[PDB]
Design a protein around this ligand. Sequence first.
Ligand SMILES: Nc1nc2c([nH]c(=O)n2[C@H]2C[C@H](O)[C@@H](COP(=O)(O)OP(=O)(O)OP(=O)(O)O)O2)c(=O)[nH]1
Ligand code: NA
Ligand code: NA
Length: 156
Amino acid sequence: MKASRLYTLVLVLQPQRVLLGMKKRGFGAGRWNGFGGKVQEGETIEDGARRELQEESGLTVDALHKVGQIVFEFVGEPELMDVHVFCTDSIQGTPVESDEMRPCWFQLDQIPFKDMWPDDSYWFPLLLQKKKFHGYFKFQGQDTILDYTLREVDTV
Ligand SMILES: Nc1nc2c([nH]c(=O)n2[C@H]2C[C@H](O)[C@@H](COP(=O)(O)OP(=O)(O)OP(=O)(O)O)O2)c(=O)[nH]1
Ligand code: NA
Ligand code: NA
């Protein structure tokens, strides 16, 4: 059995558009994604998600709703990444580029899947349907999935 490290991921999903950020450096650089990062000691997972959203996108939200959890495993890495996925539809400021991320809105018929992590093609459609999910993906490097599981759930 492996140890896991906690991460968050936040999608601002509105009726006709979703906010993504182009990751400018670090893990997943070059891919559009939601905002997020490592959970810190002492904070709830939701509050860590709110913190990362503010730090990486400039947006400050009162609350986030948990929609999924995805575990990532990489060949050659002993530690799993346990990613807790949150949404909101409700914002009240403008996104601001950070060192981590350049925010950009996408219409919901223009989700840039080819420039997102490959696994997002599987779970993002459930997020768009307002379904809840648990997933697991094993990667060789950045591009190749060797094994995965995905399930819709009623409670995350
Ligand atoms: N959409 C998507 N997001 C992923 C996948 N794998 C993965 O870790 N993530 C998310 C979780 C986090 O939001 C982010 C990874 O955290 P990070 O490296 O940006 O963490 P951080 O901000 O604390 O890092 P840093 O500034 O210290 O370098 O990417 C994936 O396959 N798909
Ligand atoms: Na971060
Ligand atoms: Na990050």
